[PDB]
Scaffold this motif. Sequence first.
Motif, PDB file in Angstrom:
ATOM      1  N   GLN A 151       0.727  -1.236   0.040  1.00 27.26           N
ATOM      2  CA  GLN A 151      -0.043  -0.058  -0.019  1.00 27.26           C
ATOM      3  C   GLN A 151       1.007   1.179   0.039  1.00 27.26           C
ATOM      4  O   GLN A 151       0.232   2.311   0.182  1.00 27.26           O
ATOM      5  CB  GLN A 151      -0.847  -0.007   1.295  1.00 27.26           C
TER       6      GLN A 151
ATOM      7  N   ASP B  64       0.540   2.658  -4.117  1.00 26.60           N
ATOM      8  CA  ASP B  64      -0.512   1.746  -4.495  1.00 26.60           C
ATOM      9  C   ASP B  64      -1.681   2.745  -5.210  1.00 26.60           C
ATOM     10  O   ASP B  64      -2.483   2.165  -5.492  1.00 26.60           O
ATOM     11  CB  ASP B  64      -0.876   0.674  -3.608  1.00 26.60           C
TER      12      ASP B  64
ATOM     13  N   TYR C  54      -3.230   4.877  -3.986  1.00 21.39           N
ATOM     14  CA  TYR C  54      -4.609   5.222  -2.930  1.00 21.39           C
ATOM     15  C   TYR C  54      -3.974   5.820  -1.742  1.00 21.39           C
ATOM     16  O   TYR C  54      -2.710   5.200  -1.340  1.00 21.39           O
ATOM     17  CB  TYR C  54      -5.200   4.063  -2.576  1.00 21.39           C
ATOM     18  N   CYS C  55      -4.451   6.851  -1.456  1.00 21.15           N
ATOM     19  CA  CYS C  55      -3.901   7.667  -0.188  1.00 21.15           C
ATOM     20  C   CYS C  55      -4.310   7.104   1.169  1.00 21.15           C
ATOM     21  O   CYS C  55      -5.576   6.878   1.552  1.00 21.15           O
ATOM     22  CB  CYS C  55      -4.418   9.318  -0.176  1.00 21.15           C
ATOM     23  N   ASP C  56      -3.637   6.455   1.987  1.00 16.17           N
ATOM     24  CA  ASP C  56      -3.699   5.708   3.187  1.00 16.17           C
ATOM     25  C   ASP C  56      -3.319   6.552   4.471  1.00 16.17           C
ATOM     26  O   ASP C  56      -3.742   6.448   5.498  1.00 16.17           O
ATOM     27  CB  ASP C  56      -3.019   4.366   3.215  1.00 16.17           C
TER      28      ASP C  56
ATOM     29  N   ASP D 264       2.614   7.789   2.045  1.00 17.25           N
ATOM     30  CA  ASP D 264       2.708   6.646   1.553  1.00 17.25           C
ATOM     31  C   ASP D 264       2.445   6.759   0.202  1.00 17.25           C
ATOM     32  O   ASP D 264       2.544   5.560  -0.467  1.00 17.25           O
ATOM     33  CB  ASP D 264       1.356   5.847   2.034  1.00 17.25           C
ATOM     34  N   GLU D 265       2.510   7.923  -0.713  1.00 18.22           N
ATOM     35  CA  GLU D 265       2.146   7.911  -2.116  1.00 18.22           C
ATOM     36  C   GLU D 265       3.389   9.282  -2.443  1.00 18.22           C
ATOM     37  O   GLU D 265       3.034   9.990  -3.105  1.00 18.22           O
ATOM     38  CB  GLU D 265       1.002   8.159  -2.381  1.00 18.22           C
TER      39      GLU D 265
ATOM     40  N   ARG E  90     -12.517   1.462   0.863  1.00 19.69           N
ATOM     41  CA  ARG E  90     -10.958   1.609   0.334  1.00 19.69           C
ATOM     42  C   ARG E  90     -10.896   1.026  -0.976  1.00 19.69           C
ATOM     43  O   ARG E  90     -11.238  -0.211  -1.250  1.00 19.69           O
ATOM     44  CB  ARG E  90     -10.079   1.282   1.420  1.00 19.69           C
TER      45      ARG E  90
HETATM   46 CA   LIG Z   1      -1.252   4.001  -0.388  1.00 20.33          CA
END
Ligand SMILES: [Ca+2]
Lengths: 105, 82, 152, 597
Positions: free
Chosen positions: B15, B18, B20-22, B28-29, D582
């Motif tokens: 992740q 990946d 997608y903002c986590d 993470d991005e 998600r």
């Molecule tokens: Ca992510």
Amino acid sequence: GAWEETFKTHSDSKPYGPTSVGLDFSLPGMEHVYGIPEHADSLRLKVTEGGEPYRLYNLDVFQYELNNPMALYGSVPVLLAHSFHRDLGIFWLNAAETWVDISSN
Amino acid sequence: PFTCLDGTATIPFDQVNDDYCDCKDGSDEPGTAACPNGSFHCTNTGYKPLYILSSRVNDGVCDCCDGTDEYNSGTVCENTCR
Amino acid sequence: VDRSNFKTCDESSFCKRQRSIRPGLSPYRALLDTLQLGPDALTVHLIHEVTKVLLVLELQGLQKDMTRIRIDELEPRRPRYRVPDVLVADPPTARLSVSGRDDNSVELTVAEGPYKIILTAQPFRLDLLEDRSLLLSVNARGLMAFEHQRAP
Amino acid sequence: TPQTDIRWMSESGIIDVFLMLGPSVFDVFRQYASLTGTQALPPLFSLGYHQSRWNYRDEADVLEVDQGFDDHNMPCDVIWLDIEHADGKRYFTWDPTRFPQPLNMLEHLASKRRKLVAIVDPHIKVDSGYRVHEELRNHGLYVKTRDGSDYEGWCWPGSASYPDFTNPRMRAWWSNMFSFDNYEGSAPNLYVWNDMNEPSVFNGPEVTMLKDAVHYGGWEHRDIHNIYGLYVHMATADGLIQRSGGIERPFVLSRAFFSGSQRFGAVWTGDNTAEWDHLKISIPMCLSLALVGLSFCGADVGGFFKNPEPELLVRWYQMGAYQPFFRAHAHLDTGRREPWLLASQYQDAIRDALFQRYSLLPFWYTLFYQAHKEGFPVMRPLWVQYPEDMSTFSIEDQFMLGDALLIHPVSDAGAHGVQVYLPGQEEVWYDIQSYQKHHGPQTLYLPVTLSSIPVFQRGGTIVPRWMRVRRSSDCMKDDPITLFVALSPQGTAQGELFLDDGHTFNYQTRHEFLLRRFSFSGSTLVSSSADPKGHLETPIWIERVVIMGAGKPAAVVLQTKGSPESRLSFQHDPETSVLILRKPGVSVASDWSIHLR
Ligand SMILES: [Ca+2]
Ligand SMILES: NNNc1ccc(NCCOCCN[C@H]2C[C@](O)(CO)[C@@H](O)[C@H](O)[C@H]2O)c([N+](=O)[O-])c1
Ligand SMILES: [Ca+2]
């Protein structure tokens, strides 16, 4: 002013004389009408009994003011009538200067 | 696993980047446009590095002089670090 | 706020003429002897009772529950303007039928209903109904005014 | 007993009236649309934000403005060039000192994926060195007087003549003038603004053309007046289509308009004023235009005349961000008011308004696709959606976007709250900022700050957003969608999404588009095709689902045609009953379903 007509200093030679056309429409059950832009006025159109009719004539009005029926830059001769029970529309397909009177009873 | 720079979570490494903002801080991005507050690092080899907004990764506009912010957008950026 | 640049209705000579006509008994009447049901329209002659000017009413029921009313002079010295390029198509018509008649009235049915048009002969008047509910009237206040083309 | 009477009085022509019997207002929309057509589908970029003023100085000013948006992280699709960009108001020209290389400027803007709009007015300077004037004079395409001479009036370049746009040969000439060979310095990212097309004539009666001027076929100007502007708008839009070989959709703004103008682009309410009451009146003016088919409507953000105080400019951006045509514009003698010139707190609220607008572009685009297909207005009075609630019949400080969003912008200085009427029996409404649910009908007192834009999502609707705001819409048009599902009291919702390439007629000539239906019932979100004829190659995918009014599930399962059954991680807020799914990761062209177990 039925034929040759002047306004301020401009002269209309009106070579065909008076040729205007008009017609009224009754909308039983309707208390709210809308449309015929463009006017700097309310969404629900006002009765014109004590004042000017709404004017449809594309005009460039410098520093136009609010809440009045003066003709502005565009003209769509379409009126919508709305009530609890039904909706109706009138489309007056005419390209000349057009005035619209609205009265409630 | 990977944990955000602000400790708001801990996610598997699949992740990171990946798309997608986590993480709340966007950490993470670093290589994508997924986070609204993230940054992308223009290495600009041999010259001055630069940070740009994540929203300018693969937007079709050349933001880094080395062109590495456009790698999957259909815009081919030339190296202009000269 | 100097609006003398723009005409009020009174300063517009055709607006002043038309607006001086007030609600009352209309001088127009349909000549039911001239009635004609065509493929696309009903046509009937109208007449001004005082001036004897002859007009032509072209009445049409249209697909999608619409009615079109067109009035022109019968014998104009010169053609009147009809707005081009605004309509995207010639509107598809629906067939009218006479479903009722007396000495001062002709009832018309649009296709097979429920919409009907009542043409009153004297004074000229149009009423539009769905079944027996009156939807709208035309010239009910007698304000129809059609200035015919005079000698230039 | 209650009754309204309507009287129409026209100077000439025949009597020609259409009676449209409904019975519902959407029946009236369909009836009128079948007569005069529907709103032209705007290219996506034209639904973004337009930055304009009278006037940007030169190419360097335009490029500084372009760079200003990026340096201050504010999105913008179009920068506008008013009349000072031409050579002495000779249209289709460029000032040789201040705009000497328009192709370079347009190429610089293209590299930022932005467009430019240039003003082209229908009055032509009387000037034997002006090639446009010479050709129209030599081919007899001007409006004439009774003695047969070409009409001459006064406008921006001084003495000017007026092409006879009622003549179809003149309109073809005009359209061909927009080819890239004829309009030197123009490029595919240059679009057009038709102004003064009433026509405005400074030394004429009521600032317009003499009634007894003569047009094609011998008709007098009194016969044709109200469609003169429409013919300008039409000929310009056809010219932008023809210059591309029939592939690119036009964008033309017009000031004058008539029935049918919706087929040719956008209109705006002209020269308003930087005052609070002019801000308020933009709603009833554009609402009255929406009701009669003109959905692509707006008003100058900040007011054309005078200087708005910073608080008024903030509220005007928030108002304009939720209106169809979204352009800031200003008079020659006003101070510069590009949005980054204000103090940071005003900048921040304006940027927030711009981000909300850009996030809602998929929603705006779908509403305009529905206006294009069905003739339904984008911006709607509350009574269109609640025809039996008589307390809405006059509301004009509030409006709806489609059936999904209810907007009540702040339009008073120093306001501490607004009174929002949330209509509908058995209806719920979600504050899209706090996610607080509210039952209707009620009048809610909502406290506001400078950054507040009172917006509510209707229960039972699904709103698609691009949550990745970039510098312009071209940069965003391949990005993934987030779906906002507002659950009805029955646990249901539905919505649509239209997609295409964003600027061509391929959706119509090649059926290259997507029309998706999203529906929620029971505990399942389903995506299906709302039109199977439409296929589109697109990387757009579903990156997120936000469900308002939902409890915490035990597990979330996604099924997609062609894929194994998958499990999705999720986050639930027990306070707001908001569920976030998600990264579903599914292509927007795929049928899929998400089940909440
Ligand atoms: Ca992510
Ligand atoms: N040549 N005669 N000299 C002369 C000089 C100044 C004026 N003052 C009028 C100020 O009103 C502007 C009208 N606004 C139009 C046009 C635009 O301003 C520029 O294209 C556009 O920005 C607006 O959006 C659009 O609505 C006048 N005069 O007669 O008023 C005459
Ligand atoms: Ca980039």
